[PDB]
């Protein structure tokens, strides 16, 4: 049955939610859609409620909406934020114009963590293990988060981590410009468009993240795209002939060849005092050639995680059909597909 809804204005926006959600309080608004913290009286959970902005304006917006609902509906793993609820005040496709997504509410992201506690090696072990446990699950559904950063990792009091806020759009050039954390964790091949990327870009992100946890500092705080590439190549060394071939972009490849050849540095001396196993793992993750990076599944079996590794409790995901990504449709067609997904939802 259709629950009853109530209305209220939350910053030039009239929110219409089911009675079960009480005490809505904003936390941030963007080109995506404003988000409110709220208490779901039906479950006793602190929840984040996102009201998508003009979900079915452009063909682009209509697809993004569908994309995000399909993705959130699929994620069902302890280390990934799934969907708790999705709803709309509309009573038919005809009325359907607004979409609200509900998920667990993030108390503190990983940054929040790196600036308070003094992460011990064990903490690093447990935090990175969880990210890799969730990535394995994600990459197995052939889903690429492609935007892993401290701010996209929720961590509770018990240091339990969940991966959220997947890459569902395409950051504007401006977003990625300058001295910004929105680019420091990006693999080089994606940041400079060397070639068509794959799930391996996330492992590079995990690498940058893990280094920051151990040193408490950003690994590659480039002031811009170029500076960051230099910061990266100074550590992992310039690319050899084999990697150069794999770089499709002739411009990008030609640019790299203009740089003086540098050798990969000794990570033991960069991460002074870091657990030798941690050092070794960082070397297998921060490999310039994505084909040779360690995979999430391979990393979970690494000696550094011996303490937490358990082959029987690192589940893969159900097949995720995203054939729609390559499909061209109209706004109304994307809206109905979206609608059906809303009317077919089932809480956990
Ligand atoms: C305390 O701060 C915040 C807490 C949040 N808790 C969970 N998800 C968020 N964002 C988000 C990302 C992707 C999909 C959805 S749908 C529920 C919502 C949040 C945003 C915040 O700040 C802006």
């Amino acid at each position: 049955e259709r629950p009853t809804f109530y209305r209220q204005e939350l910053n030039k926006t009239i929110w219409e939610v089911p009675e079960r959600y009480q005490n809505l309080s904003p936390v941030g608004s963007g080109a995506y859609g404003s988000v409110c913290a709220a208490f779901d009286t039906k479950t006793g959970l602190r929840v984040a409620v996102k009201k998508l902005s003009r979900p079915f304006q452009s063909i682009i917006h209509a697809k993004r909406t569908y994309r995000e609902l399909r993705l959130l509906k699929h994620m069902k793993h302890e280390n990934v934020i799934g969907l708790l609820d999705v709803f709309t005040p509309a009573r038919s496709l005809e009325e359907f114009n607004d979409v609200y997504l509900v998920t667990h509410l993030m108390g503190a992201d990983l940054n929040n963590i790196v600036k308070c506690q003094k992460l011990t090696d064990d903490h690093v072990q447990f935090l990175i293990y969880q990210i890799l446990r969730g990535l394995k699950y994600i990459h197995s559904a052939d889903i690429i988060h492609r935007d892993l950063k401290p701010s996209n990792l929720a961590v509770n009091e018990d240091c339990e981590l969940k991966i959220l806020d997947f890459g569902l759009a395409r950051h504007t050039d401006d977003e990625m410009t300058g001295y910004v954390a929105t680019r420091w964790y990006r693999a080089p091949e994606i940041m400079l468009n060397w070639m068509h990327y794959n799930q391996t870009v996330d492992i590079w992100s995990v690498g940058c993240i893990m280094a920051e946890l151990l040193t408490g500092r950003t690994l590659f705080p480039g002031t811009d795209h170029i500076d960051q590439l230099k910061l990266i190549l100074r550590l992992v060394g310039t690319p050899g002939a084999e990697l150069l071939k794999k770089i499709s972009s002739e411009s990008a490849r030609n640019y790299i060849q203009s740089l003086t050849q540098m050798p990969k540095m000794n990570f033991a001396n960069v991460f002074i005092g870091a657990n030798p196993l941690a050092v070794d793992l960082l070397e297998k993750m921060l490999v310039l050639d994505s084909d040779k990076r360690i995979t999430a599944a391979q990393a979970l079996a690494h000696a550094y995680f011996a303490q937490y590794h358990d082959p029987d409790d690192e589940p893969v995901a159900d097949p995720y059909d995203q054939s729609f990504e390559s499909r061209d449709l109209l706004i109304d067609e994307w809206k109905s597909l979206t609608y059906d997904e809303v009317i077919s939802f089932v809480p956990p």
Side-chain angles (χ1 to χ4, degrees), residues 26-28 33-37 46-52 68 72 81-85 100-109 112 152 154 164-166 168:
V27 290
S34 304
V35 179
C36 284
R46 290 298 164 197
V47 292
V49 181
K50 181 187 181 188
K51 162 180 181 180
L52 298 179
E68 176 164 42
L72 290 166
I81 281 178
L83 185 60
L84 293 174
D85 193 28
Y100 296 80
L101 303 161
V102 177
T103 69
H104 290 287
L105 176 71
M106 166 169 59
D109 58 30
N112 293 129
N152 292 334
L164 75 139
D165 205 3
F166 285 56
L168 297 180

Side-chain angles (χ1 to χ4, degrees), residues 307-347:
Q307 161 93 175
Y308 302 95
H309 181 43
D310 172 7
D312 298 309
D313 187 40
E314 301 169 346
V316 299
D318 287 340
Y320 180 63
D321 186 315
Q322 57 186 304
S323 61
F324 68 95
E325 288 281 26
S326 67
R327 199 178 305 152
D328 283 298
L329 300 176
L330 300 185
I331 282 165
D332 277 357
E333 285 167 341
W334 284 121
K335 185 163 79 176
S336 175
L337 282 173
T338 291
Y339 188 57
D340 295 315
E341 287 296 336
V342 180
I343 70 177
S344 73
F345 175 67
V346 175

Side-chain angles (χ1 to χ4, degrees), residues 64-116 119-134:
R64 279 180 168 177
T65 297
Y66 182 66
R67 185 181 301 135
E68 176 164 42
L69 176 45
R70 282 291 307 286
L71 177 69
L72 290 166
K73 281 187 67 180
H74 196 64
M75 305 297 82
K76 297 178 181 179
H77 181 284
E78 307 166 8
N79 303 124
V80 180
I81 281 178
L83 185 60
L84 293 174
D85 193 28
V86 46
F87 62 70
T88 176
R91 297 152 184 289
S92 69
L93 180 59
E94 295 59 55
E95 298 174 56
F96 188 52
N97 273 296
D98 279 317
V99 184
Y100 296 80
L101 303 161
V102 177
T103 69
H104 290 287
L105 176 71
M106 166 169 59
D109 58 30
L110 195 67
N111 283 301
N112 293 129
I113 303 308
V114 176
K115 87 145 184 290
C116 310
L119 305 186
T120 65
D121 187 48
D122 195 63
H123 283 158
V124 178
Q125 276 182 43
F126 189 49
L127 288 166
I128 298 301
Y129 170 80
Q130 297 178 78
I131 297 181
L132 287 173
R133 183 163 181 276

Side-chain angles (χ1 to χ4, degrees), residues 133-169 171-195 197-327:
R133 183 163 181 276
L135 268 181
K136 177 196 175 184
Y137 167 82
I138 295 171
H139 289 179
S140 48
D142 271 305
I143 292 168
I144 309 178
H145 186 296
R146 64 184 174 70
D147 198 66
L148 280 189
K149 322 177 308 195
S151 71
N152 292 334
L153 306 175
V155 181
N156 71 27
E157 291 282 72
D158 287 338
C159 197
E160 297 186 298
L161 176 156
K162 281 179 177 297
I163 297 175
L164 75 139
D165 205 3
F166 285 56
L168 297 180
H171 282 282
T172 59
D173 296 345
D174 177 63
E175 297 295 322
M176 296 294 269
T177 295
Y179 191 65
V180 293
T182 66
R183 190 192 65 243
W184 305 328
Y185 309 99
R186 291 312 191 70
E189 70 269 35
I190 199 170
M191 175 185 89
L192 298 173
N193 292 323
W194 288 349
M195 55 201 89
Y197 74 73
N198 37 50
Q199 68 186 53
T200 56
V201 300
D202 293 340
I203 292 307
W204 177 277
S205 302
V206 175
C208 295
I209 292 179
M210 189 181 154
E212 186 164 336
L213 292 192
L214 294 165
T215 69
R217 302 296 175 191
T218 315
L219 184 55
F220 302 120
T223 61
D224 63 77
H225 295 229
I226 299 305
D227 183 55
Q228 194 170 313
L229 173 60
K230 291 170 191 183
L231 291 184
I232 293 173
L233 297 197
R234 177 159 145 291
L235 174 74
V236 307
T238 50
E242 184 174 352
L243 177 55
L244 287 170
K245 305 160 190 162
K246 308 179 188 181
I247 292 177
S248 317
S249 162
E250 198 199 308
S251 292
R253 184 174 61 222
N254 169 250
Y255 172 57
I256 298 178
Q257 295 169 186
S258 83
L259 302 173
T260 302
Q261 268 169 279
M262 309 176 93
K264 159 183 173 312
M265 292 182 86
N266 183 326
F267 287 38
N269 287 163
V270 174
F271 307 104
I272 306 167
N275 179 322
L277 292 175
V279 169
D280 180 71
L281 183 62
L282 283 183
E283 297 188 302
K284 313 276 198 53
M285 295 194 296
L286 302 170
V287 175
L288 198 53
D289 183 330
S290 79
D291 286 325
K292 308 183 189 297
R293 289 175 198 151
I294 194 167
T295 63
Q298 291 156 186
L300 290 160
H302 192 273
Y304 184 53
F305 298 122
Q307 161 93 175
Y308 302 95
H309 181 43
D310 172 7
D312 298 309
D313 187 40
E314 301 169 346
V316 299
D318 287 340
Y320 180 63
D321 186 315
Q322 57 186 304
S323 61
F324 68 95
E325 288 281 26
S326 67
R327 199 178 305 152

